[PDB]
Amino acid sequence: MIQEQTMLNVADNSGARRVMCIKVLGGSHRRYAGVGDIIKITIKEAIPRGKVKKGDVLKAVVVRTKKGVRRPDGSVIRFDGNACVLLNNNSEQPIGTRIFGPVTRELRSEKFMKIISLAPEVL
Amino acid sequence: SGDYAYGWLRTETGVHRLVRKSPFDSGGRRHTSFSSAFVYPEVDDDIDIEINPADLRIDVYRTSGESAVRITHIPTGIVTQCQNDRSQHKNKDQAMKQMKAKLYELEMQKKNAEKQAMEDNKSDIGWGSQIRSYVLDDSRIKDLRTGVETRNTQAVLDGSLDQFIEASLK
RNA sequence: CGGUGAUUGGCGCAGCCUGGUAGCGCACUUCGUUCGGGACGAAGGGGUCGGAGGUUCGAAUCCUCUAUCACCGACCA
RNA sequence: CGCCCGUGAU
RNA sequence: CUCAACGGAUAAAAGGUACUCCGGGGAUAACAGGCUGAUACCGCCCAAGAGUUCAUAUCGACGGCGGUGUUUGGCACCUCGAUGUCGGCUCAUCACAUCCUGGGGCUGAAGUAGGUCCCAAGGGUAUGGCUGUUCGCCAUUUAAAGUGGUACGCGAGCUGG
RNA sequence: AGGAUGUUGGCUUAGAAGCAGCCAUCAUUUAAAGAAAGCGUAAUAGCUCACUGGUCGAGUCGGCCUGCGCGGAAGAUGUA
RNA sequence: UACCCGCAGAAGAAGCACCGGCUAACUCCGUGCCAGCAGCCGCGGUAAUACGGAGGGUGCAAGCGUUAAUCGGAAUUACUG
Numbered sequence: 001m002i003q004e005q006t007m008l009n010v011a012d013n014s015g016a017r018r019v020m021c022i023k024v025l026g027g028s029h030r031r032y033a034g035v036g037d038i039i040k041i042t043i044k045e046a047i048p049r050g051k052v053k054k055g056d057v058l059k060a061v062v063v064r065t066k067k068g069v070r071r072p073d074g075s076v077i078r079f080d081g082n083a084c085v086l087l088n089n090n091s092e093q094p095i096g097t098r099i100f101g102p103v104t105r106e107l108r109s110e111k112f113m114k115i116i117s118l119a120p121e122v123l
Numbered sequence: 124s125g126d127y128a129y130g131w132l133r134t135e136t137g138v139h140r141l142v143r144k145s146p147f148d149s150g151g152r153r154h155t156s157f158s159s160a161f162v163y164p165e166v167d168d169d170i171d172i173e174i175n176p177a178d179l180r181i182d183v184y185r186t187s188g189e190s191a192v193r194i195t196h197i198p199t200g201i202v203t204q205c206q207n208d209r210s211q212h213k214n215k216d217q218a219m220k221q222m223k224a225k226l227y228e229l230e231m232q233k234k235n236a237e238k239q240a241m242e243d244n245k246s247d248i249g250w251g252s253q254i255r256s257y258v259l260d261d262s263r264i265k266d267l268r269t270g271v272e273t274r275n276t277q278a279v280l281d282g283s284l285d286q287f288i289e290a291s292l293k
Numbered sequence: 294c295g296g297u298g299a300u301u302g303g304c305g306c307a308g309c310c311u312g313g314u315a316g317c318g319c320a321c322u323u324c325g326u327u328c329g330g331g332a333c334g335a336a337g338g339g340g341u342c343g344g345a346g347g348u349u350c351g352a353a354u355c356c357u358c359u360a361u362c363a364c365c366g367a368c369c370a
Numbered sequence: 371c372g373c374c375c376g377u378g379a380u
Numbered sequence: 381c382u383c384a385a386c387g388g389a390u391a392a393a394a395g396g397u398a399c400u401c402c403g404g405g406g407a408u409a410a411c412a413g414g415c416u417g418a419u420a421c422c423g424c425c426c427a428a429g430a431g432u433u434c435a436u437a438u439c440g441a442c443g444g445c446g447g448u449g450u451u452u453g454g455c456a457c458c459u460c461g462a463u464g465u466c467g468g469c470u471c472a473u474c475a476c477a478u479c480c481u482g483g484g485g486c487u488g489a490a491g492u493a494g495g496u497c498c499c500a501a502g503g504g505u506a507u508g509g510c511u512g513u514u515c516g517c518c519a520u521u522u523a524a525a526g527u528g529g530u531a532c533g534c535g536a537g538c539u540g541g
Numbered sequence: 542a543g544g545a546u547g548u549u550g551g552c553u554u555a556g557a558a559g560c561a562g563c564c565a566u567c568a569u570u571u572a573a574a575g576a577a578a579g580c581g582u583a584a585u586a587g588c589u590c591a592c593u594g595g596u597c598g599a600g601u602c603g604g605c606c607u608g609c610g611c612g613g614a615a616g617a618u619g620u621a
Numbered sequence: 622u623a624c625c626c627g628c629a630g631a632a633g634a635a636g637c638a639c640c641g642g643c644u645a646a647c648u649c650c651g652u653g654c655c656a657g658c659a660g661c662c663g664c665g666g667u668a669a670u671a672c673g674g675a676g677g678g679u680g681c682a683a684g685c686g687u688u689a690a691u692c693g694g695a696a697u698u699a700c701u702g
């Protein structure tokens with residue numbers, strides 16, 4: 001349940017450490033982005049020699065939220081913080097080469113099979 | 124002023140070098156001096172293009188402090204505002220004449236830039252940038268561009284340029 | 294927008310009130326002085342008055358309209 | 371009493 | 381006696397008030413209404429041309445004729461024994477000169493994407509940075525971020541920059 | 542049904558044969574036919590037209606003056 | 622294998638840098654403050670031993686030059702001095 005001004009950690013190794021959400025894409029008057037939802041971000045702090053510089057405007061996909069995903073039988077999976085993976089602005093393909101931490105099975109789609117393979121653990 | 128004048132003279136632009144026993148040197152030494160000729164044609168200076176309302180968009184709004192106007196140009200995209208008088212018609216008139224000034228100065232600024240550009244393109248009147256030598260000691264003239272010699276300097280110095288113009292007209 | 298005053302030689306200025314004659318400084322031209330330049334000394338030329346129309350025997354001058362510039366005001370809700 | 375200046379070839 | 385304010389008030393006279401006060405006036409302004417419609421906006425008529433040729437796919441000069449009430453105005457009919465002002469918030473409602481979605485004609489319409497005109501008002505029709513702002517510029521969205529009337533809708537509903 | 546010939550009339554263009562545009566614009570055969578009114582082509586070609594016969598068997602054509610109508614004709618609470 | 626013997630035949634086997642002064646070794650032609658050279662001083666602006674080629678020289682030689690880097694020369698950090 002990510003909205004504008006929400007600060008997200010970064011699950012890949014693009015260089016960024018913190019990003020801010022500046023728009024939830026995909027509809028008019030759309031409030032929240034959950035796991036699997038593309039967002040427009042801006043970079044608020046980066047590591048000194050990454051691929052992305054502080055102040056960039058990019059896309060990202062949410063992979064962990066602490067609101068959680070609800071499964072078909074009624075279960076819930078919640079994490080301790082919100083995280084996202086940085087995407088190229090046009091192709092919408094991952095920028096980094098590694099993923100940290102677990103991801104979930106709501107990314108199992110034709111777009112994000114690159115992320116599922118790299119994830120240490122899929123729940 | 125003549126017919127086909129610039130065609131004949133356009134090949135003279137450049138630096139001319141003179142070698143000669145100096146009369147301004149007390150020791151009577153041999154010196155080299157340079158001067159430059161630059162030839163450009165007369166232009167028709169057409170800036171008679173005026174405001175065509177087909178390509179003017181005008182907005183009237185309420186003053187910041189609906190008397191304020193905001194004129195903008197459709198193709199150039201340069202806007203103009205005025206909030207001088209309480210009548211908008213006074214403001215509306217003042218802006219388009221101000222708009223006229225704004226259009227006009229782009230044309231002037233565009234022509235001012237290309238003049239400085241050709242000022243940068245001109246060679247300095249100094250060593251090495253010569254195109255003709257006029258060494259009057261041994262009475263030799265050499266256009267080092269074509270390159271046509273001559274041993275009759277006095278005739279050249281009086282207007283026998285027919286030797287050089289035609290050959291320089293490659 | 295109105296309103297009050299200016300346009301005179303290449304440049305900076307008088308003359309207009311109160312009609313009949315345009316003047317000054319610098320600059321310019323020639324000569325002299327100096328080896329030469331500047332400074333200096335002696336001669337000389339150049340403007341029909343922003344434009345236009347009126348009044349008058351006569352207009353830079355008086356009147357009216359214009360163009361450009363400068364100053365000033367545009368105030369209460 | 372007042373008197374400034376003299377470019378660049380090797 | 382330029383008593384020229386020329387039927388001449390005294391021989392002899394300038395200003396400030398946002399610190400203000402009284403008697404009055406919608407006889408007279410400022411806001412909104414009204415009448416009008418020069419201006420503004422929308423439409424149409426003629427067609428010189430531009431569009432390789434080809435006025436009329438799309439534009440259309442020099443000129444002409446209307447509509448709306450819709451900007452800036454003109455007037456002074458209402459209100460001065462009072463009709464609270466810009467913007468924001470809340471809540472709206474109508475028109476259609478249609479922004480999207482729907483249906484069509486022509487195209488300088490191969491397709492995708494467009495241009496332009498006709499019909500259509502059922503529903504829908506952004507969030508932020510700056511600034512008191514409406515507006516505007518900018519960032520990023522959206523199928524689209526319509527144009528207007530309603531005392532420039534709305535203070536006995538809120539605020540008060 | 543037919544609606545020709547010299548002749549791609551002259552100039553420039555790349556092209557100008559009708560058509561970017563410029564000057565004009567005769568002759569021959571019947572019956573009629575153009576240095577072309579129109580669409581198309583780059584030019585062609587082609588498709589028209591103007592023009593004349595055969596059929597058909599009563600009217601037909603487009604101007605002027607006039608009467609009454611049609612379009613031009615879109616707004617906000619509700620027909621109005 | 623090192624070495625030794627036999628065969629044939631001058632046969633298979635020379636370049637690089639310099640030549641104004643310092644520094645050993647010079648003349649002609651081309652160019653004309655250009656093109657170019659250069660460690661320092663400096664050469665080229667119409668008779669260039671200094672640029673470029675040619676002839677001739679000089680020095681090293683299976684190498685010869687250039688660049689980098691150290692000490693010497695430098696008594697120019699001097700204890701000697």
Ligand SMILES: [K+]
Nearest residue numbers: 385386387388
């Ligand atoms: K009086």
Ligand SMILES: [K+]
Nearest residue numbers: 394395396397
């Ligand atoms: K007083």
Ligand SMILES: [K+]
Nearest residue numbers: 396397398399
């Ligand atoms: K005060």
Ligand SMILES: [K+]
Nearest residue numbers: 411412463531
């Ligand atoms: K009101």
Ligand SMILES: [K+]
Nearest residue numbers: 416417448449
């Ligand atoms: K009306």
Ligand SMILES: [K+]
Nearest residue numbers: 423424446613
């Ligand atoms: K109309």
Ligand SMILES: [K+]
Nearest residue numbers: 417445446447
């Ligand atoms: K009208």
Ligand SMILES: [K+]
Nearest residue numbers: 406459460462
């Ligand atoms: K009142």
Ligand SMILES: [K+]
Nearest residue numbers: 473528529530
């Ligand atoms: K509304």
Ligand SMILES: [K+]
Nearest residue numbers: 476500501615
């Ligand atoms: K309608």
Ligand SMILES: [K+]
Nearest residue numbers: 478480481482
């Ligand atoms: K539609």
Ligand SMILES: [K+]
Nearest residue numbers: 484485496497
């Ligand atoms: K259409």
Ligand SMILES: [K+]
Nearest residue numbers: 500501502503
């Ligand atoms: K609708």
Ligand SMILES: [K+]
Nearest residue numbers: 186187515516
């Ligand atoms: K503004």
Ligand SMILES: [K+]
Nearest residue numbers: 464535538539
């Ligand atoms: K109140």
Ligand SMILES: [K+]
Nearest residue numbers: 465466467535
């Ligand atoms: K209010």
